[PDB]
Amino acid sequence: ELPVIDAVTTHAPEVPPAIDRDYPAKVRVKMETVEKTMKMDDGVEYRYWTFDGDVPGRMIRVREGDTVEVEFSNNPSSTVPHNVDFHAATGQGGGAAATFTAPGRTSTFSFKALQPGLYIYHCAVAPVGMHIANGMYGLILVEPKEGLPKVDKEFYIVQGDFYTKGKKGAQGLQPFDMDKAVAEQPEYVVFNGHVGALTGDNALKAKAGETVRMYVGNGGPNLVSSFHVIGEIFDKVYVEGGKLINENVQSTIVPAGGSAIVEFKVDIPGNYTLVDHSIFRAFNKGALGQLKVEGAENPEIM
Amino acid sequence: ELPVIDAVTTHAPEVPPAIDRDYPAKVRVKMETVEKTMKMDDGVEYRYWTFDGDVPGRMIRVREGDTVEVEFSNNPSSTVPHNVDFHAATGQGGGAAATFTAPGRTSTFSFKALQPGLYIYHCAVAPVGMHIANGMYGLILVEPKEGLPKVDKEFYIVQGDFYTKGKKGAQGLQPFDMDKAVAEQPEYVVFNGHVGALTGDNALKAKAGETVRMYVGNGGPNLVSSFHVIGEIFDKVYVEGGKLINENVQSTIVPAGGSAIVEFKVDIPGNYTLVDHSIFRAFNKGALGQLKVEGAENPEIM
Amino acid sequence: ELPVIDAVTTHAPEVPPAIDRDYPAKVRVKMETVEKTMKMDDGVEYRYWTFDGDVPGRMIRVREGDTVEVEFSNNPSSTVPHNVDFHAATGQGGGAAATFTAPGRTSTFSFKALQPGLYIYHCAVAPVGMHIANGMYGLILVEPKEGLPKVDKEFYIVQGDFYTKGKKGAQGLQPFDMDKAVAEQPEYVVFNGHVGALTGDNALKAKAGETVRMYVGNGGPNLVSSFHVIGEIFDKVYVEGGKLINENVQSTIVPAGGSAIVEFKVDIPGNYTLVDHSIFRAFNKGALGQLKVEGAENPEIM
Ligand SMILES: [Cu+2]
Ligand SMILES: [Cu+2]
Ligand SMILES: [Cu+2]
Ligand SMILES: [Cu+2]
Ligand SMILES: [Cu+2]
Ligand SMILES: [Cu+2]
What we know:
3 copies of one chain form a homotrimer.
Chain A lengths: L3 E3 L19 E16 L2 E8 L8 E4 L3 E8 L10 E2 L19 E7 L4 E6 L5 H6 L3 E7 L9 E10 L9 E3 L3 H5 L5 E4 L12 E4 L3 E10 L4 E6 L5 E3 L6 E2 L5 E3 L3 E8 L4 E7 L3 H6 L2 E7 L8
Parallel strand pairs in A: 1-2, 2-5, 3-11, 4-9, 10-14, 13-21
Antiparallel strand pairs in A: 2-3, 5-7, 6-8, 8-9, 10-12, 14-19, 15-18, 15-20, 16-17, 16-19, 20-21
Bound molecules: copper (II) ion (6 copies).
């Protein structure tokens, strides 16, 4: 009946420890859905619907072949039901039916992680687009039996497009705007739920010489990302999050509800900024993050 | 001088029989273009321009090296000329020049299927975007000499974006809207020409344990699909319809005027819904289909 | 120390000579940024911001391991600063910081081309989107140590979306429109800076039987291209400009700020038109180019 393991799920930029076991296990994951008002941008508030308090949800890391047992709780203060659809799960709605949880209630269910990959998980309660648009999406990494190559640093990044009634910058609590959502005209396109979530004081950090791996998800609802890191090149790209590996790519497409894994070695100090290369989203809508690399200067490289 | 064979072209969800011959042949295909009003959605009618009566056109299945002889007929009642551009054909407009057919006339021409792959074919009469937008696109599968691996079930799925004058839901006969087409703002995004074409009573059917292959095309005119099947994972993906094969992909990009071949084994009963994961298209514009899988329950999977 | 070779850069359709050396070198490149008014379309003028007088900039061709020394000059008549971010360069802004050049000034800096590939380079002065949108982008091809396979013809093609205040066709000098840029609603989508740049008398030329390679870039700012050549099929596609090679692809995605290398043999005479298969961009917004192939007819093909 498999060894029991309490999963270590991480809040985002952080990734759980690499899997140091070579046998299947039942991994217990606890998830709670809570609705809360937070800052989208300076002076701009939004009513986010979250998985564990923020956007994206906590990253789950398991091994191919594991049984994932989820204890799904919908906070008592929630105003609507919530559930979870794991793209990593095979079967009815990816777990949506089994995890339909009204406020103040807890659901439990398990699924076997049959295939390795970087999968998006999100709420699938009607209206599906609204539950996703309000921030209910995260990533679950299903490692191959053999595991992934060691890397110096790992980051959890999820892009998403938000639809605000007021336009970008309008002060105050901004409601979700269904019409802009349907027309695919977001006001904010950000990494990890807020403008600046991965910038300024919250910038990611690495040291010169380190090999960096970024687990990049795209919660959508609607946009497709042309992911790029200014100042660097992708040594490796797990195309669309699958087994296929591309090399020397400057910018990759991350499908809606899809992902990608990028790896690059940062050999020289400086500030590298992650962006959706559909450029105006980055410099006008918030799809901008920073990777600060400390260390010492090599004039030969630049 | 090559044996002559009358091809079997199927209406959509269905795929023609796998090629059971290991020698080149001249495959005779008969195509007719007919304009007709049909139901886009409940109470919503649209004037479709079709290849053989519906959207998409009939799927053609040939073998690499075959000579495809097309007898192209434009129905007497058509109001405009029609032709066909096969992405599988090498040469002037992919056959567009040779197949320019006025109403009540018949054209004939042949081309050699030089390269294996899943190719889109569509009308290319000016204005090209309008002819495509009204539904004139289908898929031609060109099998490799050695043929494709046996599979239990095969489905013909083609996504397309439609531009209606009224907004989604507006009752009555809705005219094509050029302005929305140019701005890439469709009202309907559907699989196989109509909302629900592959859902409800028209849902695709398979049995638990069967390996399923879906020939997925994207007629456009403008959108790019983040194809995904809720509840399942792609075991194999012929990237962009070519020779390259990816594995364990949750969601793939299907280029405009492009395709993809996805294969997955359905091991547990239930309802799986195909969607464009640019989510609002699926739950708000119609890009939603269903694969009903009967059989017996495996709790170990979920 | 390394040898010093002056680089041979080319204006677009043309590609520099293949690298005929098997040792590292310091390649001197001279670039000048000049702002000038040119014809976007018949009767339509636009104030382009360019790298060396046109869009795209001159193509640079170097070898993996080379040190690229850039003498960057901002023409005295320019009204704003300009710099360059090479996606091929590893380090601070891809050279943006070191190349920030006010009008009438010259900057110099060097970087080591560590990785092979087809890279986009563009201006990164605030506001970044505007500098890119006005035409400041080009390609730098970094050949692998071993070099790329010989081909009969090579073409330099870069797609880009332009945001005009007036709508497509509006006569006169059309100003950049920030609002359309942010909403990702371009008026013109073209290959090589202007409508018709690669068509009519400016059509690309090849002879029947020749193997053709196209270095395709996508300067954006915002669109993603579903690159396709009507009448032909891609024998090889360097996926997203990386090492990975796909085959028998009808249409590939070229990411914003990304690229692709496509190779195909043109075996039969005729006119082949390159397009963004998000069709309305091609036939309504200008994303249309032509490849005129000379030679002699083969009815066995079509
Ligand atoms: Cu929810
Ligand atoms: Cu860039
Ligand atoms: Cu999903
Ligand atoms: Cu037509
Ligand atoms: Cu086409
Ligand atoms: Cu500039």
